[PDB]
Design a protein around this motif. Structure first.
Motif, PDB file in Angstrom:
ATOM      1  N   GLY A  78       0.871  -1.113   0.000  1.00 22.33           N
ATOM      2  CA  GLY A  78       0.000   0.000   0.000  1.00 22.33           C
ATOM      3  C   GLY A  78       0.943   1.205   0.000  1.00 22.33           C
ATOM      4  O   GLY A  78       2.151   1.130   0.227  1.00 22.33           O
ATOM      5  N   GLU A  79       0.342   2.333  -0.207  1.00 18.51           N
ATOM      6  CA  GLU A  79       0.935   3.574   0.204  1.00 18.51           C
ATOM      7  C   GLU A  79       1.867   3.809   1.501  1.00 18.51           C
ATOM      8  O   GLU A  79       2.646   4.729   1.448  1.00 18.51           O
ATOM      9  N   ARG A  80       1.677   3.162   2.668  1.00 18.25           N
ATOM     10  CA  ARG A  80       2.723   3.170   3.711  1.00 18.25           C
ATOM     11  C   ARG A  80       3.704   2.010   3.582  1.00 18.25           C
ATOM     12  O   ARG A  80       3.306   0.860   3.350  1.00 18.25           O
ATOM     13  N   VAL A  81       4.986   2.314   3.780  1.00 15.92           N
ATOM     14  CA  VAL A  81       6.074   1.351   3.649  1.00 15.92           C
ATOM     15  C   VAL A  81       7.028   1.555   4.828  1.00 15.92           C
ATOM     16  O   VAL A  81       7.723   2.569   4.906  1.00 15.92           O
ATOM     17  N   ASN A  82       7.041   0.613   5.762  1.00 11.81           N
ATOM     18  CA  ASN A  82       7.935   0.697   6.908  1.00 11.81           C
ATOM     19  C   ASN A  82       9.153  -0.186   6.695  1.00 11.81           C
ATOM     20  O   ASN A  82       9.013  -1.383   6.448  1.00 11.81           O
ATOM     21  N   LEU A  83      10.324   0.441   6.793  1.00 15.08           N
ATOM     22  CA  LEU A  83      11.611  -0.225   6.643  1.00 15.08           C
ATOM     23  C   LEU A  83      12.240  -0.421   8.023  1.00 15.08           C
ATOM     24  O   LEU A  83      12.221   0.494   8.838  1.00 15.08           O
ATOM     25  N   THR A  84      12.830  -1.592   8.321  1.00 11.68           N
ATOM     26  CA  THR A  84      13.580  -1.799   9.519  1.00 11.68           C
ATOM     27  C   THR A  84      15.039  -2.022   9.011  1.00 11.68           C
ATOM     28  O   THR A  84      15.220  -2.879   8.241  1.00 11.68           O
ATOM     29  N   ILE A  85      15.983  -1.227   9.448  1.00 10.27           N
ATOM     30  CA  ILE A  85      17.362  -1.272   8.922  1.00 10.27           C
ATOM     31  C   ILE A  85      18.414  -1.554   9.971  1.00 10.27           C
ATOM     32  O   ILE A  85      18.274  -1.199  11.073  1.00 10.27           O
ATOM     33  N   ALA A  86      19.480  -2.229   9.575  1.00  9.85           N
ATOM     34  CA  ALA A  86      20.716  -2.338  10.370  1.00  9.85           C
ATOM     35  C   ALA A  86      21.850  -1.435   9.722  1.00  9.85           C
ATOM     36  O   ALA A  86      22.241  -1.617   8.610  1.00  9.85           O
ATOM     37  N   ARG A  87      22.385  -0.523  10.500  1.00  7.03           N
ATOM     38  CA  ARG A  87      23.421   0.394  10.023  1.00  7.03           C
ATOM     39  C   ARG A  87      24.770   0.010  10.647  1.00  7.03           C
ATOM     40  O   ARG A  87      24.903   0.049  11.880  1.00  7.03           O
ATOM     41  N   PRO A  88      25.773  -0.356   9.834  1.00  8.44           N
ATOM     42  CA  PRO A  88      26.936  -0.992  10.449  1.00  8.44           C
ATOM     43  C   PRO A  88      28.180  -0.088  10.620  1.00  8.44           C
ATOM     44  O   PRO A  88      28.655   0.514   9.659  1.00  8.44           O
ATOM     45  N   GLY A  89      28.675   0.043  11.842  1.00  6.17           N
ATOM     46  CA  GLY A  89      30.104   0.280  12.051  1.00  6.17           C
ATOM     47  C   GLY A  89      30.794   1.647  11.850  1.00  6.17           C
ATOM     48  O   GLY A  89      31.512   1.859  10.866  1.00  6.17           O
ATOM     49  N   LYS A  90      30.575   2.555  12.805  1.00  6.24           N
ATOM     50  CA  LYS A  90      31.435   3.738  13.071  1.00  6.24           C
ATOM     51  C   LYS A  90      31.629   4.737  11.920  1.00  6.24           C
ATOM     52  O   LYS A  90      32.364   4.437  10.971  1.00  6.24           O
ATOM     53  N   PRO A  91      31.031   5.937  12.005  1.00 11.02           N
ATOM     54  CA  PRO A  91      31.160   6.771  10.808  1.00 11.02           C
ATOM     55  C   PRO A  91      32.388   7.696  10.841  1.00 11.02           C
ATOM     56  O   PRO A  91      32.594   8.484   9.910  1.00 11.02           O
ATOM     57  N   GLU A  92      33.163   7.634  11.916  1.00 10.38           N
ATOM     58  CA  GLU A  92      34.346   8.465  12.048  1.00 10.38           C
ATOM     59  C   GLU A  92      35.504   7.617  12.518  1.00 10.38           C
ATOM     60  O   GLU A  92      35.411   6.935  13.542  1.00 10.38           O
ATOM     61  N   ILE A  93      36.608   7.684  11.786  1.00  7.21           N
ATOM     62  CA  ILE A  93      37.797   6.935  12.152  1.00  7.21           C
ATOM     63  C   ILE A  93      39.027   7.732  11.785  1.00  7.21           C
ATOM     64  O   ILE A  93      39.125   8.260  10.679  1.00  7.21           O
ATOM     65  N   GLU A  94      39.961   7.806  12.725  1.00  9.71           N
ATOM     66  CA  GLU A  94      41.264   8.379  12.464  1.00  9.71           C
ATOM     67  C   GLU A  94      42.221   7.216  12.243  1.00  9.71           C
ATOM     68  O   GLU A  94      42.321   6.319  13.080  1.00  9.71           O
TER      69      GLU A  94
END
Length: 95
Positions: A78-94
């Motif tokens: 239908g018109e509503r679409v619910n996404l469940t997501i996994a986002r992996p691993g640290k967006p800042e690294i030196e």
């Protein structure tokens, strides 16, 4: 570590696209987001990101899914679409 998030989008007609590129990888199970299309539904929402893993759509399980399967679910959605997501691993690294 990883972050679990839930994104809800809304199609403005049965046939609207979400603006998302989905791929599979030969190295780990699952479907991933490769990129968002400029100006699309997903970009405007501003919550999905490259390399996010789609765990589910509309309470349907895709942890072991294919990109054909997810399209199937979204093209039927239908018109509503619910996404469940996994986002992996640290967006800042030196390094």
């Amino acid at each position: 570590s990883m972050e679990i998030l839930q994104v809800a989008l809304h199609k403005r007609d049965s046939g609207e696209q979400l603006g998302i590129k989905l791929v599979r990888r030969t190295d780990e199970p699952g479907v991933f987001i490769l990129d968002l299309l400029e100006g699309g539904l997903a970009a405007q929402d501003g919550r999905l990101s490259s390399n996010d893993r789609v765990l589910a759509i509309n309470g349907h399980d895709l942890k072991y899914g294919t990109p054909e399967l997810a399209a199937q679910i979204i093209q039927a959605s239908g018109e509503r679409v619910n996404l469940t997501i996994a986002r992996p691993g640290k967006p800042e690294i030196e390094l």
